[PDB]
């Protein structure tokens, strides 16, 4: 039971957008599309297959953001020689997760990249 422009699956509502936005803008955008809306989240393979089939069927081949950002920013980064980490020269600041409308495998990419996305919310 979702708005006409959205697609349902297991009590949830999903909608793909092809307006090229980076991760942060994508998420924020999803929140104003409906109450409780966010970038899509996957709790199972069936759900992932569903969203992929949906994204591909709508906009064909492309890359779509997932609701995961700054995936390694909080990891325990350490020098193998035990040097303390003070100097820094990261090529990319944060990495976010995306998926190709071709398959359900999770992929990595800098969060400042531009991509499509899918929004979701509980019906």
């Amino acid at each position: 039971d979702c708005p006409s422009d959205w697609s349902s699956y297991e009590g949830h509502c999903y909608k793909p957008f092809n307006e090229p936005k980076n991760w942060a803008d994508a998420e924020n955008f999803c929140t104003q599309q409906h109450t409780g809306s966010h970038l899509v989240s996957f709790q199972s393979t069936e759900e992932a297959d569903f969203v992929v089939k949906l994204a591909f069927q709508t906009f064909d081949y492309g890359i779509f953001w997932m609701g995961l950002s700054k995936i390694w920013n909080q990891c325990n980064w350490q020098w193998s020689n035990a040097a303390m980490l003070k100097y820094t020269d990261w090529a990319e600041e944060s990495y976010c997760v995306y998926f190709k409308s071709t398959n359900n495998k999770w992929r990595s990419i800098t969060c400042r990249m531009i991509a499509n996305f899918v929004c979701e919310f509980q019906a």
Binding site: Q43, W72, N73, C75, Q78, W79, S80, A83, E92
Partner: protein, 129 residues
Amino acid sequence: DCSSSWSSYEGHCYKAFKQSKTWADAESFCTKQVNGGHLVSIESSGEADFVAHLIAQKIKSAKIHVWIGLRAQNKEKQCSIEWSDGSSISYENWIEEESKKCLGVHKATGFRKWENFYCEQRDPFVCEA
């Protein structure tokens, strides 16, 4: 003072190797070349210059990168805690090569910028003692 074929900078000895190895193997290899050896650690601009130039002397390709001693300890695929919707992560579908927890430098940035790479890739490296 450094062993023959090793270069020195600010009291340390460095050495670039063309032989390709996984991050863990390079680290392990470096420990056996000289006591106290490890994959190079970059703790300042000055050292970054020295190491970048050092590498540029032996590595001329862009087909590969050069391993450096920084790596994410965690064994998990990601370190955040939840999705943007607030729910917890309880199902992953990662492509092994897609989790890049080891760092390296590439020729395109002059071997300076730290880029994330899949730890199991075979690539040249630099040892520091």
